[PDB]
Amino acid sequence: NPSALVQAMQKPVASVTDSFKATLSAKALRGVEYASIPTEAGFEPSKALGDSVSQYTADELEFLSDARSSAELAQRRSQVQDTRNNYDAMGQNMLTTVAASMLDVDMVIGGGVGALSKVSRATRLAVGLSATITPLDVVGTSVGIAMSAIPGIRKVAKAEQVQQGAVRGGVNAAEDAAGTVVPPKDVTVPPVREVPEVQPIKTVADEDYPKIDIDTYSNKEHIEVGRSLKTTVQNAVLAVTALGDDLPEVRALGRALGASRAEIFNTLSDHVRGMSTYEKTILLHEAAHAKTGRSIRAVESGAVSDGVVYEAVQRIKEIQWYVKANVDTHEFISQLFNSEHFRDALRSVKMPGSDGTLLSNLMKRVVTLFTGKAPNAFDATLQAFDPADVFLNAPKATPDLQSKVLQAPNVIEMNNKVMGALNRNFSLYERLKSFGYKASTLADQLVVDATGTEANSAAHHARAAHLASNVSIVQVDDAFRQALSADWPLVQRLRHPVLYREAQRDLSQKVYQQLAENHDRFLKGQSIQPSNDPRVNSMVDAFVNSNWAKDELARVKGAGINGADAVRESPYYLPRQHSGNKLNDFMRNNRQVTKDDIVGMYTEQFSRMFQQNGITPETARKLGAKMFDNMQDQAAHVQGYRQSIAGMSYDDIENTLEALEFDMTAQYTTKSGDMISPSMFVNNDVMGLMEGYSRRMSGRVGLAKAGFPDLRDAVKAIDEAAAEAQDPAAALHAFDNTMNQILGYPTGEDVPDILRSASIIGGALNLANSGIYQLADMSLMLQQFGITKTLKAFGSTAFGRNAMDVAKSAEFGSRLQDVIEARHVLSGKYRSVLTHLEDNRDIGSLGVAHRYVQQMGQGTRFVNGMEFIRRGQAKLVSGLIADTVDDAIAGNASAVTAMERFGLNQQLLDELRKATAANPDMRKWPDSVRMDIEAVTHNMADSIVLENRLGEIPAWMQFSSVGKVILPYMTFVAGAWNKILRRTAKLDGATGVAIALAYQMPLVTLSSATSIAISGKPVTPESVAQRALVQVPMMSWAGFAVDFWANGASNNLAALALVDRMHAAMSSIASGETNPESLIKAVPFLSILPGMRLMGASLADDD
């Protein structure tokens, strides 16, 4: 009874997750490697572990509770063990665990076993060790070490020398044998000479590796000697006295001081030996400034009330006060040293309260300070008070940086140059402001990421909104993968690449059709019913519970974005569009149907739709013809804004009327008697229809919150701003290109999405003293290493020659650059080839996939990585075809006689030459000859893929000079792959970050080399390495690592979540706080260096 009152009046116990904050805490970034495992009905991770739950550290349990089936749990329990084994070795040295927080890719990108726990432990360790004298310096130095170890390279060896060395082993290692079998009484020499079976290999220290060191003394008082070796004052002084036999018997003063900062010499026992007697006395004279360390402690409450020193400080401050009336402590104390007549001034006065000159008693207390022995050594300092390269230096603003391109004379220029090399956006924001004043105001509303105010640009809000969508797109992506996990094991996918693609098109059609019924039934108050195919029910369920459909309709209504209330809502909603690809592909197989029929088809619909408004027949035909002209533009990716300003960009009738309801079942009849209907040309895929909608709606929502809820005034504000600069034409083009990028339209260039980079602008001073510049400088030197090794590798191989040489020639370098950059393929005439290759073949078509499926670990890290290479190779092939077609049209006979192998004839060529002459722009081919040259190219595209598999040059391609560089490429890369797997043999994260760079680095090198030559300057490795930085700054290199780790919707979460974690830390730093947590979080680009080491060094190894 009474115990009821006690519990009735208590307060409820807190949750068991309110504690453990900063340890438990985003599941998508942790289950990428297990995505394609089917779910198990009624599985429960807690009920399956049973008694075993008592052997984990409260975060391993967090990582283990995500299992959805027995196999997933079995694999997670395996990964947790490798995670322990890796960190056991690194625990041998405390400092190395501090640098593990910034250099383990699994922990900084995603997929590791706990990330918060490691960071929250590294911060505590860094704080503890400092009790390299402040917590920031411990973080800074922990990475300077662990990266300065010069690597060793393999080299061929002579067999005899190695065998001699190995024979001196065994001997010198068998003298410890007891020899109780076959005693010495029974030994004899064998009648034949033996020889061991060692391999002929050496090891040699590398020569091009840089000598990396970190500066940690700029922001503190320090002593420079001979203006390297770094030591402390209390260490240097002792060495001077010991090796100081040539000093006046001053030596006792040195001994006394040695028992009482940072020092740098530009082997310690010999540095002091190479000094004259005079200098090494000035070294002690400046070391007598030890007072500063003690003046500070008596201003702060460190030396609370300790006698002697506390009284000496008070009676020095009293004298400091006295001199003002009758004739901070640091300046007075410094003047006592660094001047002559100042001392003479104090001699001509006696104290008002004791015997002795004012100067005499002042010195009495300095000895108490820099010695600490209470109140005879005054004679020594008196005589030490009577040009050398030793000085005492106050803190300076600009650190010492080793890289060439970062040095600047003042703090503003250095800050401007540092941020340029990290983020792409900064150099764009800078270039926008040169267009006068109106541009400057408008620039702040589009691209900047303000750190000190609420009003923030449109790109920031769009980035913030685009994460919410992807958190729900992923849950549906993982359901599609699981629906085909059975019936298609990895081995089968590699054999039948073409057919595998249809297994997805079938499910997409089924699910899309199923979601149409349940929407129309929901909207009319009827009842929903399930289907009889078990996959469709699961796919639909994963869609309703995803919940993004209502979220988007709620968000878009926020801020009232134009005519958005007209839309209707339901959990099964899905937009509607036509597809220009399905129209062309259908019109290719059938040639009885011509343009004359599609326009008539749409005319019938348009005439019936607007009957009540008295639509005259002429307008019906005009609208029918303008639904075809702007449908071809959709397939070729030549659209842009300024054509969808009336409303939103997802209605097919508004976009047709703005340019000056469909039955979808009514059947039309063509000339040949074939029947046709508009349903055949509707879009069907789901994911490609979800991402497109989400990306553009995020861009519209972000733009509204910046102050432009409707684009009509957004256009006007640009037209008015451009008419202020000296060249209005360029400014308008720049702003149009920026707006197209923000809204998510194809600009035709090959660049990463604008949302993936930040434009932080804020306090220059606070950033400099945080120490970020030193860490940015280090990561920028290692580029020299990789690029130098790549240039050497090109210089070595025969294929590297003539390939590094075509790039210099003005006759061909320009075309090779265009082929690498994919500038003729991404949009315009030729995109049909890229579309056909992109979504009609699988990883099994590479050929290289078969050759490595068993060395590489046969897991997800193989398939996830191979898509990146597919999407790399398709662009090269398409660019080669595009180049060799224009060359043929130009007049090169040797190309024409190879073009005709696939079906050209005089009739097509004459018309093509005629058409090209009238108009060289040609955003698209004319309707008269479209369907023939289009088929000619597609036939070629297929053939090359079959003959080129091995990495060989087909016989009929011997004419093309540029093709000699592209076709054999994949054999060159395979060489680097073999050497890396001969060094690690695992394919873990560090190996992936090396393979991706091994594939992607050389193309950048060739493009940059071509770019430098045409500008009439010499091409040296340093020049190439510096020019590469203005194409792919550091934060874009990490983009490739993410691209090789995850694919599709899961990529966006990781790529975006790194940037905000950087902005949120630099904002806090700029405000005035420098918590080491902030420094750790503020440099996510530093993760790829250890992976860089493996690739960079591996290119020097012998075969």
Partner: protein, 100 residues
């Protein structure tokens, strides 16, 4: 008694999980061939009492050595594939080293 104790020791999760890559100590080398592995016991033909199928057992040329060297690597690759397949499905037994 040993079996009974081991069963309920396994049931309690006292055994560490194996890595994702097979341990180096599980591979087969010449020292294991000398130890007597691949011995098939009694048989009719000389070729049918060694699992590798080599005939010469008294005087052997280098051609037999090359075939043996290739076949050892073949068996190692087969074992690696089997181990990977078993590990991925989460069906590996509670054994280590020589037992595995």
């Amino acid at each position: 008694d040993v079996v009974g104790k081991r069963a309920q020791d396994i049931a309690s999760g006292k055994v560490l999980a194996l890595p994702a890559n097979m341990p180096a100590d599980v591979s087969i080398t010449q020292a294991d061939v000398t130890a007597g592995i691949f011995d098939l016991g009694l048989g009719k033909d000389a070729r049918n009492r060694n699992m590798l199928g080599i005939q010469s057992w008294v005087f052997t040329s280098d051609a037999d050595e090359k075939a043996a060297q290739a076949r050892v690597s073949q068996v190692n690759s087969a074992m690696n594939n089997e181990y990977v397949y078993n590990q991925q499905r989460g069906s590996l037994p509670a054994l280590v080293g020589d037992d595995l």
